[model samples]
Target: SIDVKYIGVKSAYVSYDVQKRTIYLNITNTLNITNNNYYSVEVENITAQVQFSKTVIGKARLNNITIIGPLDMKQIDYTVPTVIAEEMSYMYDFCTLISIKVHNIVLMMQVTVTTTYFGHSEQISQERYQYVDCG
Candidate 1:
């Protein structure tokens, strides 16, 4: 069996260009994977998503494959890029309001990992919430 864990955020930034109607959100996250099987496991890909108040802000993907030995723990790091306001206009407006008044926002981070072992592929997902300062 393969286990996936969302460790924490390595770094995060939230900003906006009011005139350009763009919202910049980049977050680097750390994750841990545990391979308990006797054979090596192949990590096919990873997906990351960021949401504000249940509305999706941006999404990212890592498509490179990685290998992990049996009975081993491995750490992976990836970054989620910025999102344009047009993608989610309502959320952008909401975020802009909060950014101007509160300068803070709550973000929900979701990660999914796909792994293959013994000719079988499976996916594991983890999620967490974080508080970000949007200055």
Candidate 2:
């Protein structure tokens, strides 16, 4: 399991389990600088690559990855009215498959958060992940 933290005007908690091939994400709020001042969470890049197979015959096959998160942001600060425009995740596959073989796996994530205050903008970025092998 791997854990990563992001902090600023806004904050987020992330965790990944290598054995289970699962990821967990918690996004608190979005950035708002009108009456409210804080940081937010944004997903810039997220990806996972697998390089092995558990087949008895033929070549091994790689698996695809899916990212989930950057949930719905609520209006925490009443001073400013903020809205979520876009959120995204990324994934990739990196290894070829060979019969009954174990391959390496790498998971990566990138995020960008933007906050606007009085026509001014603030943006923050973060990255985290884990590496291991799957059966």
Candidate 3:
């Protein structure tokens, strides 16, 4: 069996299949909505940042960032969710790696999950990354 690491509200359930090395992040809309909204569930702290130029102003700014979850298990034929893909689009460059930053954000929902594995343990961290306002 695999060990689970959790933060914030603990109602978002996670299931891991050790043989396949795949993780399923399950969230329920019933338990708590306050702490679950606008949150990101990820494996590690890797992030991707997108920088762009403003048309009117001669300045460059960070447009968006992408945070990735953990990899699926080896034996499982897993497909990446569209939500995850959309999130990844924020930081589209394949060559660069970004770091996740968690600050003054509140957990509006609860998450609960279970993990199963044989030899190694698992590490998971949930983050509420700030959404930068651009005008």
Candidate 4:
């Protein structure tokens, strides 16, 4: 079995382009993964998706490989590419509201980590709501 823990959102911001009236949402999440097997494991890829109200707003991928020794833990940072308001208008509205009306928002993140041992591939997935600080 694999152990996963969500640390928190490391950083987040909502920016806008005045001329084009486009809003952008960028965020980075921290996580810790533990390898419990009897041998070292090599991670091949990591993918993360961010959503608001089940509407996908951003996605990110990390092809950089990593290795974790048995019974050891590794901390990983997932940085999402700039998310545009055009992808989902509700996100735009929410951003506006948060900057003006509310001071916080929550986003759901689905993360998948894939590891390969020999010719066998295993995937671990985790999902949770992350708090965003608007103020």
Q: Which candidate number maximizes TM-score?
A: 1
What does the lDDT come to for candidate 1? 0.48
RMSD of each: 27.1, 31.8, 28.3, 27.0
Backbone clashes for every candidate come to 0, 10, 25, 0
lDDT of 4: 0.49
* Two-way TM-score contest, 3 vs 4, winner: 4
Q: Alpha carbon lDDT of residue 67, candidate 4?
A: 43
TM-score of candidate 3 against the unseen true structure: 0.13
Overall lDDT per candidate, in order of appearance: 0.48, 0.47, 0.46, 0.49
lDDT, model 1, position 117? 22
1-135 in candidate 1: lDDT tens per residue? Answer: 555445554433434335657665686756675756575667557565543335335684444335444664344544557677666344445334244333333443344343332334345544445455665
Assess the local accuracy of residue 81 in candidate 1 as a C-alpha lDDT between 0 and 100. Answer: 70
Question: Tens-digit lDDT track for model 4 on 26-121?
Answer: 867566757565855665575665443353346854443354446644445455567566563445454342443433334433444443323344
What lDDT is reached at residue 95 by model 4? 34
Which of the numbered candidates is closest to the native, going by highest lDDT?
Answer: 4
Clashes by residue pair, model 1: none
Of 2 and 3, the candidate ahead on lDDT is 2
Q: What is the lDDT of candidate 2?
A: 0.47
The weakest ten consecutive residues by lDDT in model 2 span 112-121
